[PDB]
């Protein structure tokens, strides 16, 4: 319906983007349950630090994938207007699907 799901890399990026979408929706419309935090998948990589030998020292790498789910419960024609194209995208992949 309005089943939204995004993904951001930094510990706090979406928190302001998924904040502004709430008061855009709940002010003009109604309901709007709010941003569900969801589990963060963290893809951990480990590779050899030196070009030759030196396996005993390695630098560990990680990429955190932070999810959010808004889910506006009120699909009014007033609230769907003046909401889209206020995303001001900082990279984050917006997706609207079941």
């Amino acid at each position: 319906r309005i089943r939204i799901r995004l993904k951001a890399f930094d510990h706090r990026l979406i928190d302001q983007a998924t904040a502004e979408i709430v008061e855009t929706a709940k002010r003009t419309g109604a309901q709007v349950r709010g941003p569900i935090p969801l589990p963060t998948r963290k893809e951990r990589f480990t590779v050899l630090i030196s070009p030759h030998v030196n396996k005993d020292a390695r630098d560990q790498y990680e990429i955190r994938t932070h999810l959010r789910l808004v889910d506006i419960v009120e699909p009014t024609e007033k609230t769907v207007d003046a909401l889209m194209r206020l995303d001001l995208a900082a990279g984050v992949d917006v997706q609207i699907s079941l």
Partner: protein, 96 residues
């Protein structure tokens, strides 16, 4: 990093769409328990360098044939050189 073997990659990768991929639909359903005729396996006189897992997957910048990661598409050294200069979003010092 030995531009010949890197040029040999450009040949090897570019052959994968012509001789195989499309025409490698042959041998998939064809070489199977059906109905035999052995003329299907006589189509394997093709140049061979198109093979689906023939590339070493050298690093995209340098061309090291070692420490390649499928995620970044680069070698561990060029991962670290880049990683310390940022460039990979969400990448930092891992500790937990």
């Amino acid at each position: 990093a030995k531009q010949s073997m890197k040029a040999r990659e450009v040949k090897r990768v570019a052959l994968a769409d012509k001789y195989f991929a499309k025409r490698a639909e042959l041998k998939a359903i064809i070489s199977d328990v059906n109905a035999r005729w052995n003329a299907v396996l006589k189509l394997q006189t093709l140049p061979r360098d198109s093979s689906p897992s023939r590339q070493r997957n050298r690093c995209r910048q340098t061309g090291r044939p070692h420490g390649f990661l499928r995620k970044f598409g680069l070698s561990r050294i060029k991962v670290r050189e880049a990683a310390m200069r940022g460039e990979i979003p969400g990448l930092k010092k891992a500790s937990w």
